[PDB]
Design an enzyme around this catalytic site. Structure first.
Site, PDB file in Angstrom:
ATOM      1  N   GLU A   1       1.866   2.108  -3.380  1.00  0.00           N
ATOM      2  CA  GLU A   1       0.551   2.939  -4.128  1.00  0.00           C
ATOM      3  C   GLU A   1       0.773   4.497  -4.240  1.00  0.00           C
ATOM      4  OE1 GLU A   1      -3.025   2.300  -2.606  1.00  0.00           O
ATOM      5  OE2 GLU A   1      -4.133   3.154  -4.313  1.00  0.00           O
ATOM      6  N   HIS A   2       1.093   5.086  -2.961  1.00  0.00           N
ATOM      7  CA  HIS A   2       1.349   6.159  -2.835  1.00  0.00           C
ATOM      8  C   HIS A   2       2.553   6.860  -3.619  1.00  0.00           C
ATOM      9  CE1 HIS A   2      -1.787   7.267   0.763  1.00  0.00           C
ATOM     10  NE2 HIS A   2      -2.022   6.153   0.029  1.00  0.00           N
TER      11      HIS A   2
ATOM     12  N   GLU B   1       5.373  11.084   3.486  1.00  0.00           N
ATOM     13  CA  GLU B   1       4.068  10.547   3.261  1.00  0.00           C
ATOM     14  C   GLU B   1       3.758   9.699   4.703  1.00  0.00           C
ATOM     15  OE1 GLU B   1       1.645   9.462   1.501  1.00  0.00           O
ATOM     16  OE2 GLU B   1       1.719  10.494  -0.250  1.00  0.00           O
TER      17      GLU B   1
ATOM     18  N   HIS C   1       0.897  -1.400   0.017  1.00  0.00           N
ATOM     19  CA  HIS C   1       0.065   0.146  -0.065  1.00  0.00           C
ATOM     20  C   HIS C   1       0.790   1.171   0.112  1.00  0.00           C
ATOM     21  CE1 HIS C   1      -2.278   3.142   2.386  1.00  0.00           C
ATOM     22  NE2 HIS C   1      -2.990   2.949   1.495  1.00  0.00           N
TER      23      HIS C   1
ATOM     24  N   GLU D   1      -4.771   8.650   7.493  1.00  0.00           N
ATOM     25  CA  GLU D   1      -5.825   7.485   7.096  1.00  0.00           C
ATOM     26  C   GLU D   1      -5.946   6.469   7.905  1.00  0.00           C
ATOM     27  OE1 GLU D   1      -4.615   6.303   3.052  1.00  0.00           O
ATOM     28  OE2 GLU D   1      -6.331   5.122   2.671  1.00  0.00           O
TER      29      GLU D   1
HETATM   30 ZN   LIG Z   1      -4.142   4.862   0.448  1.00  0.00          ZN
END
Ligand SMILES: [Zn+2]
Ligand SMILES: CCCCCCCCCCCCCCCCCC(=O)OC[C@H](COP(=O)([O-])OCC(O)COP(=O)([O-])OC[C@@H](COC(=O)CCCCCCCCCCCCCCCCC)OC(=O)CCCCCCCCCCCCCCCCC)OC(=O)CCCCCCCCCCCCCCCCC
Ligand SMILES: CCCCCCCCCCCCCCCCCC(=O)OC[C@H](COP(=O)([O-])OCC(O)COP(=O)([O-])OC[C@@H](COC(=O)CCCCCCCCCCCCCCCCC)OC(=O)CCCCCCCCCCCCCCCCC)OC(=O)CCCCCCCCCCCCCCCCC
Ligand SMILES: CCCCCCCCCCCCCCCCCC(=O)OC[C@H](COP(=O)([O-])OCC(O)COP(=O)([O-])OC[C@@H](COC(=O)CCCCCCCCCCCCCCCCC)OC(=O)CCCCCCCCCCCCCCCCC)OC(=O)CCCCCCCCCCCCCCCCC
Lengths: 485, 192, 49, 35, 462, 33
Positions: free
Chosen positions: E69-70, E139, E66, E146
């Site tokens: 992904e960013h 990040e 994941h 999140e």
């Molecule tokens: Zn995400």
């Protein structure tokens, strides 16, 4: 340039012969004839079970819209894309803008009595048979239009047509059925109170068009219950529900077959006769309204009138301006100039609500309830510069608008609603290719021209939530006047 | 697959009924046979004159005198414990419901005293069918419900939620669900 | 498919004999108007009053 | 059963007769737990 | 002879057979390309479907998939963060991505003329992304936030907890985001290791749908996806172990979050390629769904669905705010069950009623119920294949799961011959007297015992 | 019918009727036929 409608004449047919065309339908399964079971038992899905007799050479379908009309005045339009699920819709030109002080709430009553008992089918058998077919159906009320719709496998279309047309041909309006629907009639606005966005929109309409046309409410009130009887309802349908005020649309259907079954629904019985009605022009007044409610945010909206509405001649210009500012993206004017330069703003956007002959345009913001005075200053400053755009902003907005249009029209539901909504408001359907040609011809001068005209009438101000620091009516008006608005 | 073979027999008899079903109204066939409809017509002039005829006429006199003594109509004799008639009573307009309420009150009082009404209060026809339109609509509503929802023997959770689980919806109406609580003050199903 | 009531003889029309017959059609009136007269409160037996 | 200040329910659905004794002894899970 | 016996009996409409073909090609390096042309469209969707996810993370670095992904949208060698964002905006296109336990997806939507420029952008960010150590640390603040918002969408939290307790002994139980301590100690070396071990040519499909040409999409892919490494095998041909299903419960009691409880129950299911997968889809539709604030035009008290009818009539008031059945397939196992929300005092009634409906599949389901469920399933599945995106998702997902796309006519032929006696056979084999797993949150004082739920999978009548 | 739980009395009705048809048929065949 209206479309050319083909004629479909009424014809008298033997009943026993038309029954050879009705699709098969079963409610009971009394035993079963087939006894072979699952003939694909033990075969995994990485292996195909098809035979050569199941292969074909593809032939594209007829995807252009075809037009037809019955002798009673009903207009019909359909298109086929080759899918297996069809969309059906009956549009009626009978919304809340046609109500009066003795009728307020009647259109909402008709929506909640949809699919009730008719001359040839009861309420229970109607809703139970739709479910068993696997279809979904409903009724939606609006300010200018009422719409009945259903979606189902495309082989069931002949079975669904009468259950849609019956609501406007011979409803019964039985007392005990009206008394069983009175509960859900009040829970609508109650459920609306806990939906901020929908409440701000209603307040915007009631305040923009004070006590006339587009300012009437959508749902009923406790006062409306004083005239909730069959005679009032039936009197309203006799003035507005004639075939000339209705359009039928289908998607993923055969045009000729749809016309035949629509003709058969109207051939043996008498429809509501036509009537001449004069449509009153809306009167825009503007004003201000507040509504305090427990909430952590201060909702605020400011808007102006759009002259002429959908048929005013500048529809495309307002849709380009909306794209520049930012709607519901990270290089829009509102994201760069407002959100990034103020951390106490939770959101902001621009809206554009157009009707047949009037509309509104404005801004909508959430913010910290302790800085409402500053929220008003930033909104006024944006209105002061709306009439100026750069070449890069304009060109990027056009490209974004064209893409959205074509992309929205990939879905069955949106296509159906757009075609029917256009034929009631203008008797013509504008294609996406014609929209693009119009988008490309929007200039910088047009933008500046429509913003000035927009500001010649008073504003419409709405506040919702925690309004403890929202300035006074005179102070909002003055701030706008200092920024050149 | 023994269940699929039995299902084939049911299906064959089912399709035969459908293929021989008319698509419009057709009079029902005579019930009694021709041998029975011939003896009756031959003995009719004597059987009707001296027995069946006077039996019919005595019956209507007995009924009319009892109803008039109490100020009642024939249709007042039906019970609200019948589901069809209960639904019909719910559909009545106020004026007809009020007159029935009053006649039933007066007739219970007269039967308690055992005193006749005067003759001039008995001058009316008691056999007017004032409930008929509402009875025929009730029959239509309940026949739809039974055909659309009650065509199979459904299963359910047993002795749960105040009901037995075999079809009852109103609680505490069978002995094995009697006595719902040991402590407390109870309550009414109509106040849930 | 029930029998169609004969209104000229005073026959009753209610329930299944309204929904599954054409007894309510009137050539010189809209269907929504005609069928509004076939609710049970619209009929009364002779001798009622 | 439990004390009155513990028997108070958060929901509104009615107590079914087979569960009368369960809810006569309701107890609040002060602080919460994971099972 | 009656006209009532001469109705038009057309099982499968002819439109099912007259569909445009889905064309496929395999390139020398192992990339697979698949396309279906839909002439009645002016736009198109193109994307890359990859066969990797959180299940292919290591226990020590769970969450890198994941995280990657960013970072894929933060810059390349030839394009920066700002330059990438502006190029997409100037075309009016869209670019999206998501990551799951076994599949990862990147796709774009744009006009036909802009399709090549989309393929160039997709290959670049997937093969030439710069994972700058300075951006990896920035990040960490956007992802830890999140994790707090995800904790506010309760349905997503419950399904994660259901995977955690059911698949304790397998990577299929890992979360997608990963633990907090792993997010705080993440480095660019952990992310590069995930890439070099998972993103190969045998695990990637390129799919498109719309106004698209197959031969031209095969040449763009051959040119821009050439620098993709091929799989390396060290003479190791060992099979993967099937995940073990643990019957267990994991419950979070909390009396300070309102009157509504949330619960989910699960059974061991079947994998994609199972000969019984179609029947599980149908069994999911027989149980169905319900919302109290959105019934529609059919009142729940008179529904044809027996489960809905029993729930709505409970104590004459109804015992559920909402419930829904689900069926999820993976490569070597599956998960079947339901989710529900309910009032504190109604929880026991609600859970036991839905269990009763699943166990009815093994004993007493009728052919009326099966045919009602078939009709609804067909309307939804066949209805969702309208846009180019939904079609492209169907192409890519099926190429990874089945190795092919199943034509519509084949699915409808397999669904047609399933009757009530076949439903009973499958439920008796997999669901009757089986292990269950449970997850819950909220005011749970009246929750049934795990053993109560376990013994409700069979009846003592019959 | 649908909505109530009177489910044993309809069974008792069919058993009683059947029993009566058999008693008066076994006596006729012994006296008459
Ligand atoms: Zn995400
Ligand atoms: C496990 C431990 C080990 C031992 C276990 C033993 C076995 C246990 C399980 C047995 C099976 C259970 C499931 C039963 C079927 C359910 C089917 C279903 O879902 O349909 C719902 C169905 C409702 O369907 P519906 O369409 O909505 O309504 C139907 C209409 O009402 C009417 O519709 P209709 O007019 O169309 O008529 C329909 C009729 C058409 O058929 C006929 O008419 C044929 C007639 C045949 C006559 C010749 C044969 C003799 C038949 C019986 C004669 C009368 C017996 C009277 C006994 C009274 C004392 C019990 O159908 C039937 O007759 C079918 C029913 C036959 C089964 C009866 C015997 C087995 C079940 C016994 C009850 C279960 C135990 C409860 C224990 C509770 C403890 C707290 O409900 C039933 O039919 C229920 C029937 C069973 C009786 C109810 C419970 C009685 C409780 C009181 C007695 C308790 C005694 C306890 C102590 C003694 C030991 C037990
Ligand atoms: C001279 C000496 C002669 C003495 C002879 C007397 C007779 C001796 C009988 C011996 C029987 C031993 C086997 C016991 C098994 C019980 C049934 C069972 O498995 O329950 C499962 C049942 C449901 O299981 P589950 O795990 O919740 O659900 C699994 C499925 O999902 C659920 O799936 P589903 O929804 O399909 O199932 C629903 C469930 C229905 O579930 C319910 O709603 C509750 C069922 C009621 C409880 C189970 C019956 C036993 C209760 C004991 C009552 C004794 C009263 C003593 C009064 C004496 C007065 C002198 O279905 C049934 O089980 C229906 C009942 C089956 C038909 C009837 C046959 C069983 C009756 C056993 C004897 C009781 C009557 C004797 C009366 C004596 C009067 C003199 O379990 C419970 O309800 C939990 C508590 C059960 C306690 C059992 C106590 C057994 C004691 C029996 C001895 C009787 C005493 C006689 C004294 C005589 C003195 C003179
Ligand atoms: C409480 C508050 C106050 C304070 C606290 C008080 C505390 C004390 C209270 C008690 C506490 C302890 C708990 C006690 C529980 C007792 C059990 C219980 O409650 O069950 C109720 C239970 C009803 O439960 P429910 O929840 O109300 O409804 C059940 C369904 O859900 C729905 O069903 P449904 O509604 O559709 O229909 C139900 C119907 C169902 O009706 C039937 O199925 C019929 C039942 C009666 C049949 C017999 C009557 C006569 C018929 C004509 C003759 C037939 C001959 C046989 C041949 C037939 C053709 C083959 O049942 C009834 O009508 C009820 C009848 C009452 C029966 C009670 C008997 C209990 C057992 C003891 C018997 C002792 C007999 C001694 C006398 C004889 C000595 C020689 O009753 C039964 O179903 C059991 C029926 C048992 C019948 C036994 C018949 C024996 C005699 C047969 C004739 C033999 C003649 C031989 C002549 C020979 C000459 C030499």
């Amino acid at each position: 340039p209206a479309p050319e409608y083909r004629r479909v004449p009424f014809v008298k047919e033997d009943m026993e012969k038309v029954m050879e065309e009705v699709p098969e339908f079963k409610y009971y399964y009394v035993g079963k004839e087939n006894t072979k079971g699952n003939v694909y038992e033990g075969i995994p899905l990485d292996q195909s079970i098809l035979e050569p007799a199941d292969l074909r050479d593809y032939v594209p379908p007829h995807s252009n819209i075809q037009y037809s009309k019955l002798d009673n005045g009903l207009r019909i339009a359909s298109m086929d894309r080759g899918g297996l699920t069809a969309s059906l819709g009956l549009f009626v030109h009978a919304g809340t803008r046609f109500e009066d002080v003795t009728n307020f709430g009647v259109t909402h009553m008709i929506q909640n009595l949809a699919f009730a008992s008719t001359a040839h089918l009861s309420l229970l058998r109607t809703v139970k048979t739709i479910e068993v077919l696997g279809a979904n159906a409903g009724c939606v009320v609006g300010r200018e239009h009422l719409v009945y719709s259903a979606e189902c496998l495309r082989s069931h279309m002949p079975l669904l047509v009468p259950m849609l047309t019956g609501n406007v041909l011979f409803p019964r309006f039985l007392p005990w059925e009206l008394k069983a629907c009175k509960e859900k009639l009040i829970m609508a606005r109650k459920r609306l109170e806990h939906m901020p966005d929908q409440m701000v929109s209603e307040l915007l309409h009631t305040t923009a068009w004070h006590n006339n046309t587009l300012g009437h409410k959508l749902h009923c009130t406790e006062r409306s219950l004083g005239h909730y009887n069959p005679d009032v309802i039936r009197h309203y349908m006799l003035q507005h529900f004639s075939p000339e005020n209705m359009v039928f649309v289908g998607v993923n259907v055969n045009h000729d077959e749809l016309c035949t079954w629509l003709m058969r629904a109207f051939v043996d019985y008498n429809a509501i006769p036509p009537s001449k009605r004069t449509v009153a022009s809306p009167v825009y007044t503007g004003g201000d309204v507040r509504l305090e409610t427990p909430s952590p945010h201060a909702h605020m909206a400011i808007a102006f009138e759009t002259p002429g509405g959908w048929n005013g001649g500048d529809l495309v210009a307002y849709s380009v301006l909306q794209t520049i500012l930012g709607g519901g993206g990270m290089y829009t004017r509102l994201y760069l100039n407002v959100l990034n330069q103020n951390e106490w703003v939770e959101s902001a956007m621009a809206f554009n609500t157009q009707y047949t002959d009037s509309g509104i345009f404005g801004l909508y913001m959430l913010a910290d309830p302790t800085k409402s005075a500053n929220a008003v200053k930033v909104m006024a400053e944006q209105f002061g510069k709306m009439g100026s755009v750069t070449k890069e902003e304009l060109q990027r907005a056009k490209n974004s608008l064209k893409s959205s249009i074509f992309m929205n029209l990939e879905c069955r539901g949106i296509v159906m609603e757009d075609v029917g909504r256009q034929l009631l408001m203008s008797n013509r359907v504008i294609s996406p290719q014609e929209f693009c040609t119009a988008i490309d011809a929007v200039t910088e001068a047009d933008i500046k021209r429509v913003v000035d005209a927009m500001y010649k009438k008073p504003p419409t101000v709405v506040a919702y939530g925690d309004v403890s620091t929202v300035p006074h009516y005179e102070e909002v008006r003055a701030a706008l006047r200092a920024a050149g608005v | 697959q023994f269940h699929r073979e039995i299902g084939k027999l049911f299906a064959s008899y089912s399709n035969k009924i459908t293929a021989n079903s008319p698509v419009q109204y057709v009079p029902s066939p005579p019930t009694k046979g021709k041998v029975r409809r011939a003896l009756s017509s031959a003995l009719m002039p004597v059987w009707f004159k001296f027995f069946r005829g006077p039996l019919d006429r005595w019956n209507l006199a007995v009924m009319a005198k009892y109803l008039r003594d109490h100020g009642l109509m024939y249709d007042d004799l039906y019970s609200d414990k019948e589901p069809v008639f209960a639904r019909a009573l719910e559909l009545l307009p106020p004026d007809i419901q009020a007159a029935r309420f009053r006649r039933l009150m007066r007739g219970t009082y007269l039967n308690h005293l055992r005193l006749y009404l005067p003759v001039h209060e008995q001058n009316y026809d008691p056999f007017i069918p004032y409930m008929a339109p509402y009875v025929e609509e009730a029959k239509f509503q309940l026949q739809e419900e039974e055909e659309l929802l009650g065509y199979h023997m459904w299963e359910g959770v047993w002795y749960s939620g105040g009901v037995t689980g075999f079809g009852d919806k109103e609680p505490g109406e069978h002995f094995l669900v009697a006595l719902p609580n040991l402590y407390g003050a109870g309550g009414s199903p109509m106040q849930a | 498919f029930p029998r169609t009531p004969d209104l000229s003889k005073g026959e009753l029309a209610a329930g299944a004999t309204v929904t599954r017959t054409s007894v309510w059609h009137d050539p010189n009136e809209p269907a929504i108007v005609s069928v509004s007269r076939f609710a049970p409160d619209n009929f009364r037996a002779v001798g009622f009053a | 059963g439990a004390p009155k200040f513990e028997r108070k329910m958060l929901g509104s659905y009615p107590v079914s007769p087979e569960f009368e004794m369960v809810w006569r002894d309701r107890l609040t899970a002060h602080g919460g737990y994971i099972q | 002879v009656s006209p009532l016996a001469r109705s038009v009996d057309a099982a499968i409409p002819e439109e099912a057979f007259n569909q445009p073909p889905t064309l496929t090609t395999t390139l020398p390096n192992g990339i697979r390309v698949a396309t279906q042309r839909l002439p009645f469209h002016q736009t198109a969707t193109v994307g890359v479907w990859i066969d990797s996810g959180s299940r292919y993370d290591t226990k020590e670095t769970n969450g890198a998939a994941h995280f990657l992904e960013h970072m894929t949208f933060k810059g390349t060698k030839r394009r920066s963060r700002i330059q990438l964002e502006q190029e997409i905006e100037n075309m009016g296109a869209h670019l999206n991505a998501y990551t799951s336990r076994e599949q990862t997806v990147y796709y774009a939507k744009a006009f036909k003329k802009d399709i090549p420029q989309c393929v160039d952008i997709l290959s670049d960010i997937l093969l030439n992304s710069t994972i700058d150590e300075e951006a990896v640390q920035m990040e960490k603040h956007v992802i830890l936030r999140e994790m707090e918002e995800v904790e506010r969408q309760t349905e997503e939290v419950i399904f994660d907890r259901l995977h955690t307790t059911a698949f304790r002994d397998s990577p299929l139980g890992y979360t997608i985001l990963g633990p907090e301590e792993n997010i705080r100690n993440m480095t660019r070396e952990h992310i590069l290791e995930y890439i070099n071990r998972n993103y190969t040519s045998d695990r990637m499909v390129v799919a498109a749908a719309g106004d698209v040409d197959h031969k031209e999409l095969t040449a763009l892919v051959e040119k821009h996806f050439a620098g993709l490494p091929q799989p390396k095998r060290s003479k190791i041909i060992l099979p993967t172990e099937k995940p073990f299903f643990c019957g267990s419960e994991l419950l979070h009691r909390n009396d300070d979050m309102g009157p509504t409880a949330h619960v989910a129950v699960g059974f061991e299911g079947v994998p994609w390629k199972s000969p019984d997968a179609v029947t599980f889809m149908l069994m999911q539709a027989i149980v169905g769904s319900y919302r109290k604030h959105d019934e529609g035009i059919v009142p729940g008290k008179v529904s044809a669905n027996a489960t809905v009818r029993n729930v709505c009539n409970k104590m004459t008031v109804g015992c559920a705010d909402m419930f829904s059945a689900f069926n999820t397939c993976y490569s070597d196992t599956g998960l079947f069950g339901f989710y529900a929300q309910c009032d504190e005092v109604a929880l026991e009634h609600c859970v036991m009623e839905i269990m009763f409906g699943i166990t009815s599949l093994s004993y007493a389901v009728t052919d009326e119920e099966v045919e009602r469920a078939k009709a609804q399933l067909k309307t939804q599945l066949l209805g969702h294949l309208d846009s180019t995106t939904a079609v492209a998702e169907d192409i890519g997902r099926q190429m990874l799961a089945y190795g092919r796309r199943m034509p519509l006519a084949e699915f409808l032929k397999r669904l047609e011959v399933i009757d009530a006696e076949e439903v009973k056979r499958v439920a008796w084999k997999y669901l009757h007297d089986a292990e269950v797993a449970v997850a819950g949150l909220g005011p749970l004082f009246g929750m049934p015992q795990l053993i109560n739920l376990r013994r409700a999978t069979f009846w003592l009548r019959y | 019918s649908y909505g109530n739980g009177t489910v044993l009395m309809p069974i008792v009705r069919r058993v009683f009727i059947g029993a009566l048809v058999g008693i008066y048929a076994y006596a006729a065949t012994d006296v008459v036929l």
